Design a protein around this ligand. Structure first.
Ligand code: OXL
Ligand code: OXL
Lengths: 780, 780
């Protein structure tokens, strides 16, 4: 039995006293509220909040049986007897406590009939997780395929079809029961840790996500090289092998930005060396030269690191001396049996551990390391009696990787304030994106099932803050011989998901350059396409930094009033304009694409489709996967380069997909130096905008640029605008009022300013796009 | 009747007095003698000699009936009565005067029975010109195909199967009669000008050419961009069209280094504007921006210029005021009716004309022009009564273009001492290569016959000093629709001849980017190959600067004791290692290749051929032309780039064609900054050497580098050495004494240091080639 006794509004937080203790309510924004139970006691701080101490001005109103604590859009309705809080956006009930807070810690909420619930982070259970129960305990799931209730990167958070996000702001071993045990009850449980939750509301899914990232953190724009081709395997055994792989990309003519070194860089065996955190000079004899030589070819070097320091490693004595490792209750360094050997864990929650670990990253970065890979951050093994500075293993578990990213992010920004950190990790917490965390979906099997699960995983993570979630392309775990068709499909999908990083255990090659001729003939133009598409992808990344909008969006964004779409885990949007349907089984001869109502074009073949709702059936081929372009799309391209270090936009090629059904369309292209972490905040960019206005007798484009520009920005770009499905009735073109004839033949064989290709229904305009506004008007 | 009267030896020249006048003999080297008749009178100076005032120490000996004037290798034997000079190398008679000098000026020599005679410069008559008579008067031959006795660039010089070169060092309207009128008489004639000839000897064809260029001039190494892809037509009509063409290369993914602007850059019509020598702002409104924008994309701009200033042009009044034009006997500017209109000719032989013309080049170069095209330098029209500073038109005619190149070369070196001039001209004289002249074979027809004549022309010019002779690829003149198969064959041949410059009248596209899909699919990888092969071509260019060795060599170099080979005009060597046989007729299904005795490989298919003399029959296909690689060849490649401005050799791929028949082989790769005119003289280069030693049980490679290097030179190059026709019996590899196992599987699918591919008979070695010597030893 719990009931209201009294409250105090100051400041600007509401502090309620019940017969069972204090509860603190604070708005972190007009759309998000933090609710802290046991507010009177010492607890771990928030991890989910970017500004935990925030509390914006809200209004409090009182009635006989209720209190109301209201922000701009979100309202908390506090029922006095019995005590229960419920949350409203406008006058719409979003979520209501049932028993609310109990005591172990326990939160119980009602679920509404028909309410669909995404969330929990990485699970393979179906997009709607209602009817499921699972632990909140980051844990490896080696070789997973088509099912998992628990893997590397869980999130103690859900997104509802009612368009709210609920966060359990607790870092401890726990569980989530989404109407499994009791049909109408959502239950959150933890063995210890912070007793708080955060509710965020929105009026649309994009707004919800914008509001969520506003209070949990926005991802800083990654370096542009993060969008390029990575060479990776587990693992290059030597400097010679590493150099030979960089060379193979050059001689096979595949783009390459970054080569990634797994654990052999610090030891010749898988076991026994972890913690050395320094070069194995027997096998990597001249690493500074190696990294400098790669830099000369525009190629970055990334090294793997782990939380564990083995007692057999060269740094054990020093880590103990430094007090860098987590301790046992007795006060000794805690050592335990990992796969790799007996060892301890670096206490990133401590001053000593952070300083010690950070110094090592600084040293290696100074030697030439450009980016960082942190593996096993669950932590993969984490005995319950391990003691960190701020609590035992079970209490801090799901925040270890989160703090590790914060430590590394701060370290990198301190060392290189003019560069954007690259931090790729396996496990984090709500908000880890604010430290630039780029997660991957762990040690996936080399099976079709492993591939078929990746869209579900990516969308689940993307919706709750992680735009750069991706997979080991081609599959990672076990296998005895390459499944060629699977590999090809995986690397094709790879082009249209956030990070292009094929990676697998090295008894089977993961890099595309080591594949057979047919495989390379298929993949080479696609890896090149990835680079040609950089303006499209980098612009989506820019939007992700601005608003949290994920690069991969679920089908359900297309119709927010159709909750059934939430179940779709087979087609997704890559940016605004491409509907992608990966092939995830062998021998598939055709696909049924649930394209939203409207006009769509085959990305590969230019075929125009129109639909009022019924799905579209497309045949498959081995060299592509099915991708449809939304009518009204501006698809921007630059010439392929081998490395983003050579990126130039002096030449732009833009394809506009015209249809009268889209009378107004807009496109944008974000350009900056690809590297300045402050480019957005300081307006050091060149933002290109395109607007199409399509009427019965005219099609006109308005082109403009804003921003203060940047060093090396082109003043004038040669631009080729290719209008697909263009009318054969346009007689003339005006550019800023100057009338120009449209040629009707030989468009590919003359340097024509404007030409219509009747066989392709494409109208091509070639012009100079300078700093002043440009208007191009086509008229019948 | 002519007889000896007396002589005087000083100094170090021999001055002979006959009853008819004085004759001066001077050795310009140990292998070359200048013979000047009428030595007592004022004459035009030598044009052919790089150091006209040279006279090395020779020995004079006298007998009753003879004088002997001898240098290191060449001896002049002077018979006293009747007077006649003959020339000997060792004790071998090379050439004997018949009547020798007469008076118009006339030289008569005996030809030996069976002696074959190349020479005369551009003619289409057969490689051996003996039995032919033709004028020495540079003259246009618009639309030539398969025959010409007189075209743009004649040379008053011959090369004999006796291995001497004879130069008629005379610039005037003349003629050459090579045993036509009289079977055993070579006759040289001129209406006026210098009465001198130069004989150069050698002990082999390469030595002869080395000796010839020693005294006539060596070509300075061109900028590396001269070896790249040129966009050209007659002609881009506007800045917009020019920019659109640069853009088309970018969007079609063809390499492009340079775009070339024909006469529309200075006027909207073909007639009436020549002499404006300034931008037509109506059609090229922002040329400084245009050139700067191209430079940002690594693309150079070259402009056409001509000798003629029309009375209708904007510069007529000023040229007259400056006294820049040739005059009539009366002293007025000489005006005459050219195709383009009434106009005069710039007197490049005068101080005033040179200063005036040079100032105009300086101005345009300062604006951003990177290289220069001088058309119509025959001069195309040149009335006999035109007076230049040093003589009338007929007297100086064949040296006009020569002096024009000298003027421009000096101008460019004065303006940009740290760059190599690019000067492309149609007409010159013996020695013009010393001013960097890059000639092309004029306005060739768009016919198979026009293509079929190009090897003959190129070889004739190459042998007598012009390594960069090339053709308007695809054909230039007339035509009404593209002959697609002809065009393709011409641009394929283009890859294996000195300058890659498709160019034609613009009613049919000359650029490969404006061709149909099939044409582009065929040509794109070949234009890319041109760039991948830059280390091979640029190294041949280096050798040409060093020794005069032409880039294209005739088949007859392969066996100097087989004079019948001299007739071959259908196969030639591109550098040392490639025997190329262009396809020069439609529908050819196979070719008979007269490969020299030895082992040869199909460049495209790796097929091994062996022959003891009989020709090799190869089938043709549309995507290649037949090219054989000589066993022992080291073929070096770098990754394709879009422009030589981006050239890097951090990654090398070298293919060695092994065969036991070649127990010793050598290769070299010349690397410098691609631009420094002084790189060779100052040793600012990186010269890579490879030596193969192939015995019954071992194959070993010795790799080394010399030179002082240059700014940006890579210290360490990732190198992939691919050994073709490698034994399947090599068990191990030592690199500098460190033994390494050779893998026997999965060579394309692993980062192996050494791997043998049994199906391809290729052994691949991947390693780091640093500054120290490297020895790689394979042993059975
Ligand atoms: O858009 C149009 O009107 C057309 O396609 O003709
Ligand atoms: O060269 C060899 O000896 C061979 O091919 O086995």
């Amino acid at each position: 039995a719990v009931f209201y006794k009294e409250h105090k509004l100051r400041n600007d937080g509401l502090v309620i006293t019940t017969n069972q203790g204090n509860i603190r309510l604070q708005f972190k924004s007009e759309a998000a509220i933090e609710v802290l139970y046991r507010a009177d006691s010492k607890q771990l701080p928030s991890f989910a909040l970017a500004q935990p101490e925030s509390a914006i001005k809200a209004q409090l109103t009182e009635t006989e049986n209720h209190l109301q604590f209201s922000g701009g859009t979100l309202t908390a309705r506090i029922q006095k007897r019995p005590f229960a809080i419920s949350y409203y956006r406008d006058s719409e009930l979003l979520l209501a406590e049932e028993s609310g807070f109990q005591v172990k810690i326990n939160f119980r909420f009602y679920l509404s009939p028909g309410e669909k619930i995404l969330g929990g982070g990485q699970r393979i259970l179906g997009m709607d997780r209602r009817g499921q129960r699972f632990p909140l305990y980051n844990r490896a799931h080696y070789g997973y395929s088509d099912h998992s209730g628990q893997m590397y990167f869980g999130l103690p958070a859900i997104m509802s079809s009612k368009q709210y996000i609920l966060v359990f702001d607790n870092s401890a071993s726990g569980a989530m029961d989404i109407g499994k045990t009791e049909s109408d009850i959502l239950q959150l449980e933890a063995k210890s840790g912070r007793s708080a939750y955060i509710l965020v509301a929105g009026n649309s899914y994009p707004s919800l996500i914008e509001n969520f990232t506003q209070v949990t953190g926005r991802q800083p724009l990654p370096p542009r090289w993060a969008l390029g081709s990575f060479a990776s395997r587990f693992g290059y055994r030597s400097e010679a092998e590493t150099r030979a792989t960089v060379q193979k990309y050059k001689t096979e003519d595949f783009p390459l930005d970054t080569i990634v070194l797994d654990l052999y860089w610090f030891g010749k065996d898988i076991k026994g060396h972890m913690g050395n955190l320094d070069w194995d000079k027997e096998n990597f004899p001249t690493p500074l030269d190696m990294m400098a030589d790669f830099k000369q070819q525009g190629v970055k070097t990334v090294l793997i690191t782990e939380p564990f320091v083995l007692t057999s490693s060269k740094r054990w004595d020093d880590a103990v001396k430094a007090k860098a490792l987590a301790k046992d209750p007795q006060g000794q360094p805690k050592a335990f049996e990992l796969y790799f050997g007996n060892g301890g864990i670096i206490d990133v929650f401590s001053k000593e551990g952070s300083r010690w670990f950070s110094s090592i990253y600084k040293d290696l970065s100074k030697q030439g390391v450009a980016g960082w890979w942190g593996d096993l951050g669950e932590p993969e093994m984490h005995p319950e009696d391990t003691q960190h500075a701020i609590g035992d293993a079970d209490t801090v578990h799901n925040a270890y990787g989160h703090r590790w990213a914060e430590m590394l992010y701060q370290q990198q920004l301190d060392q290189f304030p003019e560069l954007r950190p690259f931090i790729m990790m396996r496990a984090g917490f709500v908000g880890s994106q604010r430290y630039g965390m780029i997660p991957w979906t762990g040690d996936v099997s080399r099976t079709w099932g492993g591939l078929a699960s990746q869209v579900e995983l990516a969308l689940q993570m993307s919706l709750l803050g992680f735009g750069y979630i991706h997979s080991d392309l081609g599959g990672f775990a076990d296998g005895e011989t390459l499944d060629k068709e699977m590999y090809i499909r995986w690397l094709q999908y790879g082009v249209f998901q956030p990070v292009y990083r094929p990676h697998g255990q090295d008894h089977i090659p993961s890099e595309p350059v080591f594949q057979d001729e047919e495989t390379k003939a298929i993949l080479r133009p696609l890896v090149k396409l990835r680079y040609r598409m950089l303006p499209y992808i980098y612009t989506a990344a820019y939007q992700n930094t601005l608003t949290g909008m994920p690069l991969m969006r679920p089908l359900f964004f297309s119709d927010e009033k159709n909750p059934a779409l939430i179940d779709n885990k087979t087609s997704y949007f890559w940016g605004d304009s491409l509907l992608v349907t990966p092939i995830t089984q062998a021998g598939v001869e055709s696909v049924s694409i649930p394209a939203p109502k409207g006009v769509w074009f085959d990305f590969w073949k230019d075929t125009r489709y129109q639909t009022d709702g019924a799905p579209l059936t497309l045949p498959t081929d081995l060299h592509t996967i099915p991708v449809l372009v939304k009518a009204g799309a501006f698809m921007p391209y630059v010439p392929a380069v081998s490395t983003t270090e050579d990126y130039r936009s002096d030449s732009l090629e833009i394809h506009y997909y015209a249809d009268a059904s889209v009378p107004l369309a807009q496109g944008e292209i974000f350009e900056d130096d690809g590297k300045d972490p402050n480019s957005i905040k300081r307006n050091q960019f060149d933002l290109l905008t395109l607007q199409a206005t399509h009427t019965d007798n005219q099609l006109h484009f308005q082109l403009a640029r804003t921003g203060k520009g940047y060093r090396g920005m082109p003043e004038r770009r040669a631009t080729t605008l290719v209008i697909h499905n263009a009318s054969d009735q346009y007689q003339h073109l005006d550019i800023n009022g100057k009338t120009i004839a449209i040629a009707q033949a030989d468009c590919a064989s003359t340097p024509a300013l404007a030409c219509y290709d009747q066989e392709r229904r494409q109208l091509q305009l070639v012009f100079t796009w300078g700093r002043e506004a440009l208007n191009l008007r086509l008229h019948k």
